[PDB]
Amino acid sequence: FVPPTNVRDCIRLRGLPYAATIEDILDFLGEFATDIRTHGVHMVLNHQGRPSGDAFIQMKSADRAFMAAQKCHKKNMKDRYVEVFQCSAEEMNFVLMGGTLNRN
Amino acid sequence: FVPPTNVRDCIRLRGLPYAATIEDILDFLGEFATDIRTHGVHMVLNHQGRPSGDAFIQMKSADRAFMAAQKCHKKNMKDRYVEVFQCSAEEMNFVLMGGTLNRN
Amino acid sequence: FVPPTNVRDCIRLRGLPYAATIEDILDFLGEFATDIRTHGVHMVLNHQGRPSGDAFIQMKSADRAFMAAQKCHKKNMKDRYVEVFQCSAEEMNFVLMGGTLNRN
Amino acid sequence: FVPPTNVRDCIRLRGLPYAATIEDILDFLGEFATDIRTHGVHMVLNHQGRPSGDAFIQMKSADRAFMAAQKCHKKNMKDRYVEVFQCSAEEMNFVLMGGTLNRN
Amino acid sequence: FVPPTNVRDCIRLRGLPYAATIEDILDFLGEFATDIRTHGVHMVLNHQGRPSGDAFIQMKSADRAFMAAQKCHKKNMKDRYVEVFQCSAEEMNFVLMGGTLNRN
Amino acid sequence: FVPPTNVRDCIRLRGLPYAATIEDILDFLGEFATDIRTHGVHMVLNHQGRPSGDAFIQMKSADRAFMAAQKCHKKNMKDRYVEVFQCSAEEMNFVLMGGTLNRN
Amino acid sequence: FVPPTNVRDCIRLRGLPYAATIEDILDFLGEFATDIRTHGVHMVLNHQGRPSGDAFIQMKSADRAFMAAQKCHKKNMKDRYVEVFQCSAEEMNFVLMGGTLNRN
Amino acid sequence: FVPPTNVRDCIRLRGLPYAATIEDILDFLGEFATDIRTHGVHMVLNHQGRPSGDAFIQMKSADRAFMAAQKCHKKNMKDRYVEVFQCSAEEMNFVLMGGTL
Numbered sequence: 001f002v003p004p005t006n007v008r009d010c011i012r013l014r015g016l017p018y019a020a021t022i023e024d025i026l027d028f029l030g031e032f033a034t035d036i037r038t039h040g041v042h043m044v045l046n047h048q049g050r051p052s053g054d055a056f057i058q059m060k061s062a063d064r065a066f067m068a069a070q071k072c073h074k075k076n077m078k079d080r081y082v083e084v085f086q087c088s089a090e091e092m093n094f095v096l097m098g099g100t101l102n103r104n
Numbered sequence: 105f106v107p108p109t110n111v112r113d114c115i116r117l118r119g120l121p122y123a124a125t126i127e128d129i130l131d132f133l134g135e136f137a138t139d140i141r142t143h144g145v146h147m148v149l150n151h152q153g154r155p156s157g158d159a160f161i162q163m164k165s166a167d168r169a170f171m172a173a174q175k176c177h178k179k180n181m182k183d184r185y186v187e188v189f190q191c192s193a194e195e196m197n198f199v200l201m202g203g204t205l206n207r208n
Numbered sequence: 209f210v211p212p213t214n215v216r217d218c219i220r221l222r223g224l225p226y227a228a229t230i231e232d233i234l235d236f237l238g239e240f241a242t243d244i245r246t247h248g249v250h251m252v253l254n255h256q257g258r259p260s261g262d263a264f265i266q267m268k269s270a271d272r273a274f275m276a277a278q279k280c281h282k283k284n285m286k287d288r289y290v291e292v293f294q295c296s297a298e299e300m301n302f303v304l305m306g307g308t309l310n311r312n
Numbered sequence: 313f314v315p316p317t318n319v320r321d322c323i324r325l326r327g328l329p330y331a332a333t334i335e336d337i338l339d340f341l342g343e344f345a346t347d348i349r350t351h352g353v354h355m356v357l358n359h360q361g362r363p364s365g366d367a368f369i370q371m372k373s374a375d376r377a378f379m380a381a382q383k384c385h386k387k388n389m390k391d392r393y394v395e396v397f398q399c400s401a402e403e404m405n406f407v408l409m410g411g412t413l414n415r416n
Numbered sequence: 417f418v419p420p421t422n423v424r425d426c427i428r429l430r431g432l433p434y435a436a437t438i439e440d441i442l443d444f445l446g447e448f449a450t451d452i453r454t455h456g457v458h459m460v461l462n463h464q465g466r467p468s469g470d471a472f473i474q475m476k477s478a479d480r481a482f483m484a485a486q487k488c489h490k491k492n493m494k495d496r497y498v499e500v501f502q503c504s505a506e507e508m509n510f511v512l513m514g515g516t517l518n519r520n
Numbered sequence: 521f522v523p524p525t526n527v528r529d530c531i532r533l534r535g536l537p538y539a540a541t542i543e544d545i546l547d548f549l550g551e552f553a554t555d556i557r558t559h560g561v562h563m564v565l566n567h568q569g570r571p572s573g574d575a576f577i578q579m580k581s582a583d584r585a586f587m588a589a590q591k592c593h594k595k596n597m598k599d600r601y602v603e604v605f606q607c608s609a610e611e612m613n614f615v616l617m618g619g620t621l622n623r624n
Numbered sequence: 625f626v627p628p629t630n631v632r633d634c635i636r637l638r639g640l641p642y643a644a645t646i647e648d649i650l651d652f653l654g655e656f657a658t659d660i661r662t663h664g665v666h667m668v669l670n671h672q673g674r675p676s677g678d679a680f681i682q683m684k685s686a687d688r689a690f691m692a693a694q695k696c697h698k699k700n701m702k703d704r705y706v707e708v709f710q711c712s713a714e715e716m717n718f719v720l721m722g723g724t725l726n727r728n
Numbered sequence: 729f730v731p732p733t734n735v736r737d738c739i740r741l742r743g744l745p746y747a748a749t750i751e752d753i754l755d756f757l758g759e760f761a762t763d764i765r766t767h768g769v770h771m772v773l774n775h776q777g778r779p780s781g782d783a784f785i786q787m788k789s790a791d792r793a794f795m796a797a798q799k800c801h802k803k804n805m806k807d808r809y810v811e812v813f814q815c816s817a818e819e820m821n822f823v824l825m826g827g828t829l
Contacts, residue, residue: 017547018125018126018127018467018543018544018546018547019125019543019544019547020125020126021122021123021124021125022124022147022155023122023123023155023226023227023333023335024226026153026154026155026226027225027226027227027286027287027288028287030225030286030287030288031287031288031289033153034153036149036153038200038201039148039149039150039151039156039199039200039201039202040146040147040148040149040160040200041146041147041149042144042145042146042147043126043129043144043145043146043147044143044144045140045143045144045145046143047143049130049137049138049140049143050130050466050467050469051126051127051130051434051543052143053466056144078547079550079595080547080550080551081551095143096142096143096144097142097143098143121339122259122335122336122338122339123335123336123339125434127434127435127541127543128434128435130434131433131434131435131494131495131496132495134433134494134495134496135495135496135497154258154259154261157258182339182342183342183343183383184339184342184343185343226333226335227331227333228333229330229331229332229333229363230332230355230363231330231363233355234361234362234363241361242361244357244361246357246408246409247356247357247358247359247364247407247408247409247410248354248355248356248357248368248408249354249355249357250352250353250354250355251334251352251353251354251355252351252352253334253348253351253352253353254351257345257346257348257351258338259333259334259335259338264352303351304350304351304352305350305351306351326747327643327747358804358807359804360804364806364807365806366807386702388598388599388702388703390598390599391596391598391599391600391601392643393599393641393643393702395747412807412808413807416746434541434543435539435541436541437538437539437540437541438540438563438565438571439538439570439571442569442570442571449569450569452565452569454565454616454617455564455565455566455567455572455615455616455617455618456562456563456564456565456576456616457562457563457565458560458561458562458563459542459545459560459561459562459563460559460560461542461556461558461559461560461561462559465553465554465556465559466546467541467542467543467546472560511559512558512559512560513558513559514559537703538700538703538704539703568698570698570705573705599702599703642749642750642751643749643751644749644750645747645748645749645779646748646771646773646779647746647747647778647779650777650778650779657777658777660773660777662773662824662825663772663773663774663775663780663823663824663825663826664770664771664772664773664784664824665770665771665773666768666769666770666771667750667768667769667770667771668767668768669750669764669767669768669769670767673754673761673762673764674754675750675751675754676767680768719767720766720767720768721766721767722767
């Protein structure tokens with residue numbers, strides 16, 4: 001199965017500290033926190049239902065997702081460097097139903 | 105408009121501490137953490153895009169959502185009593201697009 | 209009700225990052241930290257009693273409040289561009305008793 | 313000069329961590345965050361205009377200030393154990409105009 | 417490969433709450449805390465190097481491991497029913513070098 | 521007796537917080553969490569079988585132990601500034617059988 | 625040279641938080657605060673002239689120093705396990721002039 | 729009775745903050761923290777057994793006690809201006825056995 005990638009308006013955060021708060025995530029986005037679409041940030045659970053270190057956020061456009069990833073990929077949060085990956089909503093929703101993304 | 109309530113298999117957490125972690129939310133659910141259906145916990149932003157203190161979680165059934173609310177409603181998390189409300193996925197998704205739930 | 213606006217010797221900070229401290233605020237003000245009047249800086253709660261991201265500071269004169277706004281408006285603090293608005297003490301005190309400033 | 317002390321409806325927090333935020337103060341107060349009066353928390357400057365480590369908050373009653381002090385005095389916040397002292401508004405406003413309290 | 421099981425003087429804790437501390441583990445064992453053998457408790461990392469929620473403790477005899485498991489298996493720690501499994505030191509050391517126990 | 525200290529591929533953490541969890545220790549190590557060699561973190565007990573405040577971790581090489589100690593020695597975790605000391609497996613195993621490690 | 629140990633009417637506190645106050649120490653001692661003999665608490669500097677976390681207090685008798693150590697040894701102060709060791713005035717004076725005690 | 733003052737190689741801090749710490753005292757002394765003699769800082773109790781707000785410290789010389797008092801007397805520490813007096817060890821030991829200066 002190839003999750004569709006035509007519209008990449010989401011970001012995945014990977015490597016979040018176990019102690020990350022919602023404020024830590026919004027401060028890490030900085031000016032990009034106003035470019036979030038919807039009223040939710042998705043904290044991801046792994047295949048055992050446990051904290052993954054991952055989160056997904058839908059942005060207002062693919063270009064805002066691209067610029068957030070450019071600015072924030074490997075940026076510091078609580079002395080960990082957090083990965084930021086531009087992705088599609090299908091990729092996000094595939095992971096939320098238990099899928100594994102191979103694209104990196 | 106009132107969102108449908110036929111299938112009440114979700115829970116809303118209200119009054120989370122500002123520094124709540126995903127671990128603190130799963131510990132708060134306790135035995136009901138294994139009854140989460142998807143691989144996501146939704147941290148809710150208000151109409152200014154700021155943290156609301158709410159979260160939504162989809163459960164494996166309406167009975168498990170009822171039992172979680174029965175046990176966890178007004179339980180302590182870091183000295184705040186957190187409310188737990190059994191709700192439908194339509195109510196959750198309405199709030200995630202900016203709606204206000206009048207059922208309480 | 210529109211609060212008096214004749215003596216604009218205060219500043220409002222808006223859009224402070226979640227991580228903002230009192231040290232961060234004084235460092236952000238730079239040369240204007242010496243123009244602060246009293247021994248307090250007001251951190252503002254919103255209508256629900258939650259953090260707003262706003263602060264108020266009284267300065268020793270309108271001209272120094274003006275200059276703090278002119279030089280610090282939309283300056284960076286920890287990856288947010290913080291708004292700095294010149295205002296009166298009546299405007300500040302109105303907000304501190306739960307009023308809204310319509311003037312921008 | 314000894315400021316009036318008959319109505320002790322404020323609390324002084326002393327020894328705040330360098331990284332303290334308004335969210336950290338509200339989480340620290342727990343249930344007592346809802347008993348704050350006004351929409352301000354006062355962060356205190358020392359006589360060289362730098363952070364003192366102190367903050368003052370007015371509460372809705374003298375007994376709620378007593379109860380916040382009883383629960384929170386020397387409670388942990390980050391790397392500090394923060395003192396909480398029940399005091400009057402005259403004691404608070406005396407300190408905010410550069411006064412020293414000689415009561416403990 | 418089958419790890420030897422002749423001498424089952426260890427216990428595995430599984431499903432520890434995320435807030436569990438070493439003080440919590442010792443308090444949960446109650447009367448059995450004095451039957452711990454060495455000066456160490458092992459907190460287990462999963463196949464990704466991330467927390468598992470498991471721990472291993474070597475006891476002073478198989479009978480004390482059996483009695484500790486009898487008393488403490490599915491006992492409450494901070495709203496989790498924590499699993500307590502009697503096992504051998506070979507089983508414990510096999511898991512610590514990356515092995516998976518098939519015995520439950 | 522002095523334990524051998526020729527191969528220094530372990531780290532000792534000293535002065536851990538009372539409330540420390542395994543997730544707090546991994547967050548503290550950050551990038552060096554992937555440099556842990558076995559699947560266990562050893563939490564150390566004193567002669568009364570209560571927590572000593574120490575932990576030991578075997579790393580994949582002496583160079584990774586050195587780098588982790590360089591970065592993390594006296595770094596903050598919760599209420600504490602945790603010491604990180606590069607040591608040998610014999611030093612670690614001497615302490616796990618009740619020895620007092622004099623080298624510092 | 626080993627300092628004389630015949631009259632053990634002092635206590636050594638060890639593992640204080642470096643931000644420890646005299647009120648912290650008196651409150652920790654509880655009933656034994658009134659068993660202090662001199663009008664002083666001797667806060668100890670380390671070999672670099674920095675805070676050690678140690679203090680010495682001369683008590684009214686060896687009997688009262690023994691009972692203080694029985695009741696207060698490893699009792700909690702601000703999430704530390706504070707050690708209380710019964711010792712002689714010669715041991716105290718030896719440490720104050722830069723000696724190291726080899727009795728524990 | 730007046731304790732002797734022939735050798736004034738100590739400092740008395742008076743009017744410490746209620747919650748005075750060793751770290752506050754060393755910071756306040758600035759360069760003079762390295763001119764302390766012995767490994768002790770003496771925090772004083774009043775006649776009720778409670779912290780008095782006084783401390784005594786022996787310095788490496790009378791002139792270093794003079795210089796520490798000159799620099800630090802009425803300097804800020806937290807919310808207080810702390811008094812610093814050059815004094816003798818006899819003054820220190822007199823107060824430690826319950827005397828009033």
